[PDB]
């Protein structure tokens, strides 16, 4: 059920971020029943918000620099994220990956690609499931994430 855990984490992250941005169609509500997954999500929102704020200007204009269209959106996502992890995986980089993905979703909502927001959830879940899963489990999974940011 690992792809779905990742999908629910990124969905929660992005829904909360869109809500705060005034872009969420309807109310924010967390649907995560697993107490531990909820704790993971809450911490990820906290550290992602902190990372984004520390580099607000960079994250704000990132998607504009990429000249995103419907046809280049996924290839650009894969290209950016592959480059990010090509010189290593760590938890800070995973957070930056999540923040970038949320900025993509904001870009999509604001620049007339709102239907692609739900695609981000699947893109991130698939990326985590295929390319980061081995690393994540080798680094004690979400307990290692929570330890790292304590």
């Amino acid at each position: 059920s690992q792809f779905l855990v990742y999908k629910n984490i990124i969905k929660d992250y992005i829904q909360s971020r869109l809500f705060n941005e005034g872009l969420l169609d309807g109310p924010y509500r967390c649907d995560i029943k697993d107490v531990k997954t909820k704790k993971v999500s809450e911490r990820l929102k906290e550290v992602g918000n902190e990372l984004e704020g520390k580099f607000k200007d960079s994250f704000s204009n990132m998607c504009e620099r990429l000249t995103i269209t419907d046809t280049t959106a996924y290839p650009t996502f894969v290209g950016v994220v592959n480059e990010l992890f090509s010189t290593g995986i760590n938890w800070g980089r995973i957070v930056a990956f999540i923040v970038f993905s949320s900025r993509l979703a904001i870009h999509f909502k604001r620049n007339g690609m709102p239907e692609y927001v739900k695609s981000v959830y699947g893109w991130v879940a698939r990326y985590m499931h295929t390319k980061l899963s081995t690393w994540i489990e080798a680094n004690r999974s979400w307990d290692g994430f929570l330890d790292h940011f304590d």
Binding site: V47, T67, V81, N90
Partner: peptide, 24 residues
């Protein structure tokens, strides 16, 4: 040299930089 590679490399440094605090 691509904007894709430029932005990915940038994100890597942002994540590395962000991590320092938490081992300090």
């Amino acid at each position: 040299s691509s904007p894709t590679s430029e932005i990915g490399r940038h994100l890597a440094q942002l994540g590395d930089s962000y991590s320092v605090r938490f081992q300090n």
